[PDB]
Design a protein around this ligand. Structure first.
Ligand code: NA
Ligand code: NA
Ligand code: NA
Ligand code: NA
Lengths: 494, 494, 494, 494
């Protein structure tokens, strides 16, 4: 059951959060954040720049000093703090869900039942890791005792995108805080508000000042300042493959900080002839259209075996046409607006290219409302591998359906991409499932499902979809610095 | 390629092995070992008893003392020694395979290509573990540094059966020596010879004296003396469920040693109607008949879905009839003799039992040869769950085929056993495979295969089929004693 | 900050707990539990026997059936339920701490700040393990996919002692429930009450019926019934070594259930001449006297280097004489009564034996109050290795001080014991600490501290002190049954 | 025992190694490699450039194709190939040790007993990892089976320095090959020869063509081509912090390949007043002077507590003055020449700067021979933190001794560096040892020892000394790509 929303939630936090206190930008500049359902300004937000990043980094470094409350704190207590944060988020779940919808556009029902649920599960999962990520005692040759300490990497710059504002904040804060790091986080200008409210809850939960610092602002300013900072030890970035490059170059051009990246994809969703048709159609719809199509791993190349192609397309068109686009606070709404005007225009551009290059437009193809950034659920059939809409990540409600004949053929075509974030296989056959999951060059392969995220299982890209993994035990690796201590002993024995 | 065998290999080792030297029993007693293909005595072997076990245990304890060569040796060097032993066994592979066949009865081609190959793979795999089984550094609360050492358990008594003499020796020595334990091993009276030859290779490889001690002799004497010994730290026993019960009592009545057990089975092999018929028929044949049916995990309840039952049975009977029983040194032979007269009689008893209780005798059922202990490949059809041949381990070439209708039914029937060693499922369907593999209460579930052992994957029983696991990383757990060291420090920091 | 206690708390739960309901014993018999501070009856408790244990086992087996709520529950949700239970115990902390003191005798301030704190930390620790104890995927030879599932062992019998009633319950429930097992728990007849109240909170927390069942009663009856039960898969026992044998023999005589034991100790605390004197005197006092001396790992052989012996003894005697024995609800009380009349008389007997065998009585030596089971803190000097008080676990406020000269001497003397639960070393020297912690044959070695338990670090005995480990990741191993699934694939690639 | 060297070993391999064949450069250009002891040319070596790197990458890519011999090979068999490679290197040990000395300058006795020993131990260690680096089965929420595959990263570019030519080749090939990767290796122009002979041994050992390809040539050409290559998945670079930046920029500017870096150090070696003097002096000498001072982790800031400074310095100067500099083939020689003229001049320039900036020149300071690149062991006293010789990595036989008062003071001064590769502490005190090992910001902290490497224990930098770890289980992480497979199942149970 979904509690009724406040469709116009008050904003309480709209500044820079450093040392558990709220700050205007050094410059006093602010930027508007807009409600994409209406195109209207929600509020002004402090416009952080390099000087604000510098204040944040110094606060973080101070909190990380040997002997500080955060460094001395029992690991188990970091877990308690994470669990307390989750409880406060749960207390404020309807507010956060409404604010998320207001600022991002996703349906409130989904904000409440999905994003907020996943946030809680992520924070709670990582809370349990805080005191369990052991180093090693090692049977080295000779008269020595050798062991490893798993220490925190240090001051962690985290730049997060607008598509799942709260969930991405949690995917970043969970592992970083579980491992004893400190954070300078840059949130998306499209969706700064929910992360800043969470900062208030971080303070309420009792995290020492400077442990989490949040700097709203723009990428070429605030994000760049983080990536290039001489006292930031590690940077994590999620966004486009384009800005990804800028990050890795800045790390190399500054202090050789450690880098992980989560970038785009053009993920293949492969429907074999023996798939359960009803399930495959529904899941392929979800795979593409979930979150207004704004998902890093959207199943944006739907490959369908020729024998079932005609029926699959027919069912897929019927399902896209039934999808309800509208006010994301309305319980019936399945699809909200796209996040902002830039994305709106980009998607319309991709739709135009699909028409121009001769993909068969089967439904949708245009704007879905006279106000707000709403786009009709759009399906192109008879898509070919060389088409722009088969190659580039659209990040909107635009489905590509491609026909194939053999399992060998589809592997090659699926893997013929510079991306490799995710893939899926729909089939009843044991051998086909195993053949495909091994052969597909992707970070996650879903079998008879899609977008199944568990805090327990890692996620991240092959190839130019990024590097490193988030979630699960793996998500702790980028947040750990390993120290070997090797001690002379009188006489080593087994 | 299989090198031509020496059909009358010379015997070089037939005494008690302690401190890298050969000894008679204190009593001077010897016992004959028999060639089961001919029923003739091969040679006499020293008959170890309590006093000889006591000498072995003292030697092992001495080798385990702090500061000893074996205790001080680098972990990596334990690996070098295991690798050296493997190389010596490989040097002597053709001889060992022939001796194995001579004393045990299994076909020489199989001793050569299967048993010896697996021995080499097992030792080489565990050589790799010797310096990699790390303890942990642990982020305990308060101002402490806490860590664990993985130490050897100490003096390990190992009692091994006659079905796979060399391979079972390797399964036991591999992990015990990788982890720096010392061993007192009791080999089967039916098949002492190959293990004793391997003792010469242990000395040759360079193992310090007292690290491995081997005492041939009988169960209620030498085996019991190990189990009950007040200075044995750990016992590993493989054999009948009946004797397994004795060992745990003897252990708890002595010094509370740590015990692992590898016992019998009545493992279900489930053939779904969508299975590959030709593959399932061949695999079900192998699953039962492998090694003269003398396999702990033999597929001795072959459940076949009713729609394919008739065809399956026809094919299975033709395959049993075609199976060549004969001189295990003849390359055409698929089945050698049973290991001894006691087993021979027991199997004839079970064949008569099946006849008496109304199972349909479809082929075989009698003695296959004049000399030795040869039994015809025997297939019973229309076997019912309450039949003795459906419940008790026969340990011979006697196949039970049962009919079932539904997947739900067969789970219940398969699991209705006090055994739980292995199980298998033959199906092309992904959901059926996952359903059954989860539902079956067995230590190993094979899917579209049978008897697939890898040194890398653990093996052992649920229920009264055993406890603990052999092989893989898991096989090291029973051979490690864990010590926590917790040290006050001036100020703990993450 | 310790809340004011209810010095005569009411009792709400005093029956058998099965399927989340309270039951009288089938026999309708009850037994009294006594307040050791006064020797008066608190209340009657249901006296469970074999029939009651049978009801509990059947309930647990039902809760463990494939497809049941507890079996289908997400691993993360098992975590949630453990966390909820912890929260409820924290809600009722003041009450439970007072009840613990009422039934056990330990000081309220200690029940509140130590026991309850450790109970919460243990449950919260294992809550975090619920969804993190991964199986493996394994690069087996050949065209196969092989992996392991870590499954629950099943129905777990858990028999817990009276020394830390609430903490020992938590040490048992945490790992068992985190791993999805079900439990039949037998609590000590001396201290049944707090565990029964906790059962009420298990129901309140939302654990499915049958997941935890508690049968209070007597050892030769209910305990034996659990250990011998044909449908109990695993047994964990903590108590005396005598019953340890009983338990392992029963298990070998019944169904081959998996067994773990935590038994006595006579743990050595070694004070080197270079120790911090004041710290070593205070910690040696704590190591022996903690919990009325009723600790499995009490430092009951205090070895002191000859050069500092006289001063250490002088200071230790002064400290023992200053230790306040009294009503455990009085804030000034450091030592409460012994748990019951049996222990009270047994300890007095050992004091008499010490006096008669020529140990030097330096202080204490008799009863400390006319009512309740109070014993004076007692210190024996010039204790020798062969003395009864140097060999047998007293489990009372009776300190043994032994003189030694050299580090090799103390190692050998410390290790010359059939026990090996714990040991400690007080020294400022790096090499001495390392030499000793390696050389000491004990499950836990403390360096410049004593009785430092974290949920994070494993604990358990060498030799006759027990087998298996509790706490840490290691605490999960005894509660896991490992299944290997090995699947034929079209073509294995790396 | 050290076999007599051939002081003029024949060169057999001097070309580009691709597909197990030898190739001239496309350009047909060659470059000379020089003997640093004489300044004379040994032989010409193929000058690989971008076009040759391209050929190597294509060969490696083909070798990595799904279904290839290398991709299909059992993991255990990769292990066998690594062990076979080690056997071959052992067979040719005396030759390789001499050739290493000829091309690099290090003493033959060291090449033989240290470098070759370590190479063998590294390869044999990683051989054991081949079939043991498991992925996970994961208890994700919902009706799913989730697991991870540990797959190879793919085509790995490996750029290795001249200081430990064979050992660095082994450190890179061991983990890459153990995990099933393919390699394009660029070796240092100063020391190409031994790596090329090993390539001949890789062929001999039976590695499939293309699995290891070696391109000799210059940095700005061949090295750059690797770092910038669009079909290289992963680059590992060891060398100066200067070139480390270029690598990371190249990766970000090309295809976002994965990057690990092993870079410079200025490692602090801290001698507390309570240290064993003779030991600390000898170990500090080794720490700095080992390998002609050409070690990433040289103890090039020797901090000595004021109370022992004068004595330590006197003893240090005596040891430096008696260190034998000469022909590296003479068994008496402790120090050979520097690797080349560039280094020779750079080091002399640092010595001049040291004198100019006011450090006290205690011994050495100049050229040690009239031919070859020999420099006198040089000791500077009264070094201050702000001096150039205290800040910049010299990479030669130049020792810096600094005085300090307190342990708190020395932590700050030690950590006040942009480097963090290693550090050491000499003390008899347990608490000072644990204090310092925790506080020091370095990848390896040695205690009462220095330069203790073991294949089992990881090594790598903090801060600008690099990122990622080599050796140990950790060395496998950078060579692994993690894939999650998440499978819908009928009903998930524990
Ligand atoms: Na917005
Ligand atoms: Na025989
Ligand atoms: Na009581
Ligand atoms: Na050279």
């Amino acid at each position: 059951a979904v509690p009724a929303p406040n469709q116009q939630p008050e904003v309480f936090c709209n500044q820079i959060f450093i040392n558990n206190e709220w700050h205007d930008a050094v410059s006093r500049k602010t930027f508007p954040t807009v409600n994409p359902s209406t195109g209207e300004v929600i509020c002004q937000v402090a416009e952080g720049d390099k000087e604000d990043v510098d204040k944040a980094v110094k606060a973080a470094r101070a909190a990380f000093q040997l002997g500080s409350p955060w460094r001395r704190m029992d690991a188990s207590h970091r877990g308690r703090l994470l669990n307390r944060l989750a409880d406060l988020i749960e207390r404020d779940r309807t507010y956060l869900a409404a604010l998320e919808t207001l600022d991002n556009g996703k349906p409130y029902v989904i904000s409440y039942l999905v994003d907020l649920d996943m946030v809680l599960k992520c924070l709670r999962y990582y809370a349990g890791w805080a005191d369990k990520y052991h180093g090693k005692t090692i049977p080295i040759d000779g008269d020595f005792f050798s062991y490893t300490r798993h220490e925190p990497v240090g001051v962690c710059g985290q730049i997060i995108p607008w598509n799942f504002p709260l969930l991405m904040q949690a995917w970043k804060l969970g592992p970083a805080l579980a491992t004893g790091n400190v954070v300078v986080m840059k949130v998306a200008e499209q969706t700064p508000l929910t992360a800043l409210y969470v900062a208030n809850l971080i303070k309420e939960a009792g995290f020492p000042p400077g442990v989490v610092n949040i700097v709203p602002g723009f990428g070429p300013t605030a994000g760049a300042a983080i990536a290039s900072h001489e006292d930031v030890d590690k940077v994590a970035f999620a966004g486009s493959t384009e800005i990804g490059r800028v990050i890795q170059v800045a790390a190399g051009s500054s202090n050789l900080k450690r880098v992980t990246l989560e970038l785009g994809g053009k993920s293949p969703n492969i429907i074999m002839s023996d798939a359960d048709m009803d399930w495959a159609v529904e899941q392929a719809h979800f795979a593409l259209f979930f979150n207004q199509g704004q998902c890093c791993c959207a199943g944006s190349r739907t490959f369908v075996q020729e024998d079932i192609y005609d029926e699959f397309v027919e069912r897929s068109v019927a399902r896209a046409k039934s999808r309800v686009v509208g006010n994301p606070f309305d319980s019936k709404t399945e699809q909200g607006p796209q996040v902002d005007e830039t994305q709106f225009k980009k998607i319309l551009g991709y739709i135009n290219t699909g028409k121009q290059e001769g993909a068969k437009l089967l439904c949708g193809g245009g704007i879905a409302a006279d106000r707000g950034y709403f786009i009709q659920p759009t399906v192109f059939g008879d898509v070919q591998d060389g088409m722009t809409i088969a190659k580039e990540e659209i990040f909107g409600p635009v489905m590509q359906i491609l026909k194939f004949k053999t399992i060998e053929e589809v592997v090659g075509r699926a893997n013929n991409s510079t991306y490799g974030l995710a893939a899926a296989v729909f089939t009843k056959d044991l051998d086909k499932a195993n053949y495909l999951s091994q052969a597909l060059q992707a970070g996650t392969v879903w079998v008879n499902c899609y977008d199944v995220f568990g805090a327990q299982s890692p996620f991240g890209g092959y190839k130019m979809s990024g590097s490193g993994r988030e979630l699960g035990e793996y998500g702790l690796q980028a947040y750990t610095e390993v120290k070997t201590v090797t001690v002379k002993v009188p006489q080593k024995n087994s």
